[PDB]
From Swiss-Prot:
Its cofactor is heme. Signal peptide: none annotated. Heme binds at residue 348. GO terms for molecular function: camphor 5-monooxygenase activity; heme binding; iron ion binding. This is Camphor 5-monooxygenase. GO terms for cellular component: cytoplasm. It catalyses: 2 reduced [2Fe-2S]-[putidaredoxin] + (1R,4R)-camphor + O2 + 2 H(+) = (1R,4R,5R)-5-hydroxycamphor + 2 oxidized [2Fe-2S]-[putidaredoxin] + H2O. Involved in a camphor oxidation system. Pfam families: p450. It comes from Pseudomonas putida. Belongs to the cytochrome P450 family. It comes from the Bacteria. It is found in: Cytoplasm.
């Protein structure tokens, strides 16, 4: 239902969009959000859904907002407000200048140098998974590849038992697309309860895994506390278990429905990296936000202290004012404009690991299973939230057309 419209919010700016169940979801999640960019929708609207909040609908405002951390603080980054207030992950819940000392350490565990160190293993897993699937001539992509491929890689980096994935993934999903069985606060606490004993164990017997590095690391010269390590490790876990998983599904669904695009990569493998970026734009999937630190007039709209504003990273690249024919996938698009990995001081620290996982996937899959389609009659269903995803993606193919490496 709709929260009563606050006195300061203009009546004509109301557009009741529900980020957890957009009305046009059946056409595809990106399409559902794109309705916010239809001809008569303002640059900044107010939805009375989920407690009521602002929504920047165009890249120009989304980028500005993300750059102005003074006015748009990440202290309360999630909608609804309850989730946003319980949200205390490091470094994501902090703004510069305090954010930096913590972001630096986090960059040390998932940055480019670590990704290069994971190249071999990422490659090996990708190939083992696809080869095992190749002869079967079918698969449930979300559970057969999208989830295990990137999640196992992350669990390897964090030195955590794979058998722990079911629980952690369940908790992460409740924070991004809650089924209603758990509030953000409850899911966060379970995530923290899980980490506490591990963090203590690794601060005693330091390992080389991401968790040991964080728990035994320093923050601009001084030792990090147990609580800080917990708040950071929990964030790393959430970031490594949802985004790449669902992005791969969006990309492969598209590829399964587009033979011509598959051929382009088949005949022109050098384009895979470029295709990666275009897909990252077209199937952008996250949308979190900021909270107003003080009353502030933004693009002619009076925003009040405390007001929450959703700044959909997903919307920038879909904005027709940033890319012509935005909904069209063009692997040759001259200037791929987007904010898929965020924008500002919080730019995705795992974007390098993500790009690597995406390119290796496209490369290794197309090489062994160049021809595949979506299971006949299958009605693909998307789900919306802080991170949007694909519920299921049944693929099929003729093993005869496949190739073993
Ligand atoms: C396609 C995949 C990915 C997408 C689209 C994505 C997107 C995002 C976005 C939009 C933000 C910033 C949100 C904000 O400003 O509040 C972000 C931050 C972050 N991401 Fe990702 N991400 C991806 C993969 C990864 C991976 C693999 C990791 C690894 C753990 C990761 C780690 C992080 C971290 C640590 C931050 C917080 C940075 C900070 O707060 O300064 N991300 N990501
Ligand atoms: C918006 C995000 C993708 C980013 C990493 C996990 C996530 C859900 C956060 O809370 C910060
Ligand atoms: K009003
Ligand atoms: K908070």
């Amino acid at each position: 239902n709709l929260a009563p419209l606050p006195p300061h919010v203009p009546e004509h700016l109301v557009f009741d969009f529900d980020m957890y169940n957009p009305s046009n979801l059946s056409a595809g999640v990106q399409e559902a959000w794109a309705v916010l960019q239809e001809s008569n929708v303002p640059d900044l609207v107010w939805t009375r859904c989920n407690g009521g909040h602002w929504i920047a609908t165009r890249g120009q405002l989304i980028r500005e907002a993300y750059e102005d951390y003074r006015h748009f603080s990440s202290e309360c980054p999630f909608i609804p407000r309850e989730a946003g207030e319980a949200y205390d992950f490091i470094p994501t819940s902090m703004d510069p200048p305090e954010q930096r000392q913590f972001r630096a350490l986090a960059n040390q565990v998932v940055g480019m140098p670590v990704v290069d160190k994971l190249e071999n293993r990422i490659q090996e897993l990708a190939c083992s998974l696809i080869e095992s699937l190749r002869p079967q001539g079918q698969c449930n992509f979300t559970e057969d590849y999208a989830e295990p491929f990137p999640i196992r890689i992350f669990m390897l980096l964090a030195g955590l038992p794979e058998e722990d994935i079911p629980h952690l993934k369940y908790l992460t999903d409740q924070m991004t697309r809650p089924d209603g069985s758990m509030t953000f606060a409850e899911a966060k606490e379970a995530l923290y309860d899980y980490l506490i004993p591990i963090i203590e164990q690794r601060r005693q017997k330091p390992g080389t895994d991401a968790i040991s590095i964080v728990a035994n690391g320093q923050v601009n010269g001084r030792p990090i506390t147990s609580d800080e390590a917990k708040r950071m490790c929990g964030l790393l876990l959430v970031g490594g278990l949802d985004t790449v998983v669902n992005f791969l599904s969006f990309s492969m669904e598209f590829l399964a429905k587009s033979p011509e695009h598959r051929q382009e990569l088949i005949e022109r493998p050098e384009r895979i990296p470029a295709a990666c970026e275009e897909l990252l734009r077209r199937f952008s999937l996250v949308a979190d936000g900021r909270i107003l630190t003080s009353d502030y007039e933004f693009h002619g709209v009076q925003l009040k202290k405390g007001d929450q504003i959703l700044l959909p990273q997903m919307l920038s690249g879909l904005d027709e004012r940033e890319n012509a024919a935005p909904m069209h996938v063009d692997f040759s698009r001259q200037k791929v404009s987007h904010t898929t990995f965020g924008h500002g001081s919080h730019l995705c620290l795992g974007q390098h690991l993500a790009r690597r996982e995406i390119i290796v996937t496209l490369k290794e899959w197309l090489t062994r299973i160049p021809d595949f389609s979506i299971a006949p009659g299958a009605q693909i269903q998307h789900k919306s939230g802080i991170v949007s995803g694909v519920q299921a993606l049944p693929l099929v193919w003729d093993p005869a057309t496949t190739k073993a490496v």
